Symmetry: C3
């Protein structure tokens, strides 16, 4: 009666739950299948899309903008993010863990300055025109796509650029100098240098990128570490009412059963393997079990209030976006810290469970560690 | 053009428009049929649900949390509301009229500390995961439901509680019969008093804390006379209400009293009958003739007054109803008769002259005939 | 290529409006639902647009609607009176004036001019149902019963403290009732409620974007714009308003609004508009074109590139939804040209020609925003 694997509606595997928007020899862009189409239980995520981006060393994703706000996050590798504005531009160096909100319609390009490592990015998108999807407008002209400038008539273009259409087509379109093949190209090492010296490394600005990784972990012991930034801590995060998390776990570590009070969590596996257990209510009852094994790039959604537990089967790190973030309270159901069960009066425990109240409190204090424990032990 | 009784889409009778979520000898929890499913004319109430809870003396609603924001209101009686947080807990004693916003996901339990009076509660619910409904997660293990802790596997449970499953199952699940029968149990006085010790009181004389239970009945009525009185708290005056953009009303009317025709400018009102009976007249527009919506209201019935729709209420017995005003911010109640808050009496003569058949003279005259305000006698 | 009536972003005065009421003294029309014509602008589903036109010395009878209104005077003059529970406020509205009318506010409208017509466009935000609103007229005419008629004899008698007969005579009169919701007033009358009114909570009264410094301005056109960050009423609605003047033969350079969904209407004149979308295997652009005439409405989705040719002297007004911090990115010219902010190395690979050449072309056009439609 359990919902496991690809039958688990909260599981979005990279193997079967993504759609490739673009892919070539240098990298790819993939968009996660819609949340609400997979399950009505997370219908309120219908206004969010998730994009995964990967590109090989010394690559560049060409200038483009979208009718969607983006909360870009670097899961693995390093990158140069340049936001191009109407009368200025800003380049930033994003290290693993760095996040940055990109207002909708902001033209931008991305570089993987690393000479040997791939760049992996996870991006939360909030569409503007249609609540369920957005469009990527590439200003560039490649064999894979026409520049949107091509949408204007000859007369408009000639009067706009104060030039003959033959020069315009020759220089910008190349649709009788040759154009690149796709929206992800490889740059010469020297070129990466020029772009690199102009970028600014992040050392909570309303604009500049931030790294939750270099803040004090909210939870930290021998089995795991948990970094988290909330809208209370960051203005970009407050605008989106979203919190972000980055958690490390050693092989054999267990993230104890817990539930987020009001936040809907979208998590992604950065590296490692994990077994996750989610509890829902069956459908005047009985609990509905949702199980899944997560691997690199897999996405999983933890609905607000649904109890959850994660067992790391290998060293692991996962990232998470918390929707409806403001004042979320993480309620643990075991351990000696943030444990809501330990906050219930003896008299209430007496009637809430079969055994006596004192017999329940005794069992509750058994586990002396908090948040992360030995999966065995 | 007269939709009345159970054919009135804005009427949600206690009799046919509720679904029982749980019921037993000590009390029951019911949820109103979805608003949007009844009428597209109130489509924007789709993200709201309404729950009615009623329990006997000395009872307790076991600890649980829900994926929905709650605006809990004690319609009748008194209760101890305890909010159990990750690392602490707060208890409050709620007298009739008290309201408190319970953030989504907050584990809480509820007790009727009164020895002879029932506890009647009405909750405005705003679901988080799905806009149309929420789930109730009970931590307890009873014959009626499994603890959500059961959803986890034995290995996770053992590791989590650092104990053998044999013990865990016996202590928390047990499926002699040690478990209670349902999610609402009866407690002994000693237990009640013990759950009362740290419970805080609002105390009108004291200085209130914006994040704790508040009672609109301890404030000065906005309207008040021989026939009825109206208490009201708005988001402008309360942060909990502001976060929800909702106002709350508590209206007292004596038998034979008429609540004059009026309309709320922008708030969509969900009203519920606390005690008594009344006849309601709501005015809508047909798809230009007017469309009439009438209903006879009694205890626990819910009725929706769409924003801008004119409405009048006639109390056929002493009455008290409570109301939730959605899209509340800066709402302006426009009365259509009487000598106060009457929008008509604010229309220049020349405009009244062409607006109605008679001269602006005769019209302004008919307007000033009623010297009462808000509440008048229903049978002069 | 989608053009004319086949362009889903084009909402013509000729066939995309529905008349709510019309008589010899004026009419009220509401635009067909945006989302019903195109899913590309589904997020405009909670908005409606109404066009109001009344001749000299007319009055729109007192009424209220379960919808927030942002009323704009396209052409003409007007007296807007907001009738509250315990008071009333009259405002003189000149061409270009805008005023927000909170939902449920009873108001009446007068065209005090002797010859000029009153033309208004209203942005509406429904309260009870997201897709439409109800207009409640207090008045009693041959076209509509007063909503008071909805209450019973007993309620009415007790409410007004009078026998029904008098009530039914003074208010309903099914010395008779007018023909419709728009009536003509004698000059004497106009003068009356005219002198009471007030022209030119301060930041809660009508405002006029044309009394501000144009954001862009030259010999070919000028652009007046008021955003949420400059007006409280606009901030509540998260809407910006625009008034653009263009002389015949002028070209508004290719550009796009970063996050604002724009609803524009042609006040006077005619224009040619070119919008760029994407088709949905080389990815091709989708061209949306149309000729915009008086009262026509056209929607520019956020992020969609657009350009406009004024084929006659022209003025258009626009509503910007999701306005907060909108960034208008121009794609040519000197000022606000995002292409000129792209580094040489990046341009080098984004286009066929070399970076230096791309840069040379981009700088060829030294003029900004508005230019002559001639190279
Ligand atoms: Ca027990
Ligand atoms: Ca008359
Ligand atoms: Ca090139």
């Amino acid at each position: 009666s359990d919902s496991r694997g690809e039958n688990n509606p909260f599981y979005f595997s990279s193997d079967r739950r993504f759609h490739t928007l673009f892919t070539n020899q240098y990298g790819h862009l993939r968009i996660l299948h819609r949340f609400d189409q997979r399950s009505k239980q997370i219908q309120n995520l219908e206004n969010y899309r998730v994009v995964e981006f990967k590109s090989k060393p010394n690559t560049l994703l060409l200038p483009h903008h979208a009718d969607a706000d983006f909360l870009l996050v670097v899961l693995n590798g390093r990158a140069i993010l340049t936001l191009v504005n109407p009368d200025s531009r800003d380049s930033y160096i994003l290290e693993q863990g760095h996040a940055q909100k990109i207002p909708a319609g902001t033209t931008f390009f991305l570089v993987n300055p690393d000479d040997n490592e791939n760049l992996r990015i996870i991006k939360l998108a909030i569409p503007v025109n249609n609540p369920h999807r957005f469009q990527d407008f590439f200003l560039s002209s490649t064999e894979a796509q026409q520049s949107y400038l091509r949408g204007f008539s000859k007369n408009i273009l000639e009067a706009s650029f104060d030039s003959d259409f033959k020069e315009i087509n020759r220089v910008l379109f190349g649709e009788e100098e040759s154009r690149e093949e796709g929206v992800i190209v490889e740059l010469k090492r020297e070129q990466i240098q020029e772009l690199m010296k102009h970028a600014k490394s992040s050392s909570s600005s309303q604009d500049e990128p931030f790294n939750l990784r270099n803040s004090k972990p909210i939870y930290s012991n021998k089995f795991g570490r948990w970094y988290e930034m909330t809208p209370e801590k960051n203005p970009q995060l407050k605008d989106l009412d979203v919190f972000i998390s980055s958690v490390d776990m050693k092989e054999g570590a267990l993230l104890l059963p817990h539930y987020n009070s009001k936040a809907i969590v979208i998590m992604v596996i950065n590296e490692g393997e994990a077994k996750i257990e989610l509890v829902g209510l069956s459908d005047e009852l009985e609990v509905q079990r949702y199980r899944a094994e997560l691997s690199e790039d897999d996405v999983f959604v933890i609905p607000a209030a649904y109890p959850v537990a994660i067992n790391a089967t290998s060293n692991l790190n996962f990232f998470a976006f918390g929707i409806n973030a403001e004042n979320n309270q993480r309620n643990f159901l075991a351990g000696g810290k943030d444990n809501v069960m330990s906050e219930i009066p003896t008299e209430v425990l007496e009637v809430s469970f079969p055994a006596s109240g004192k017999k329940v409190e005794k069992l509750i204090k058994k586990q002396s560690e908090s948040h992360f424990v030995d999966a065995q032990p």
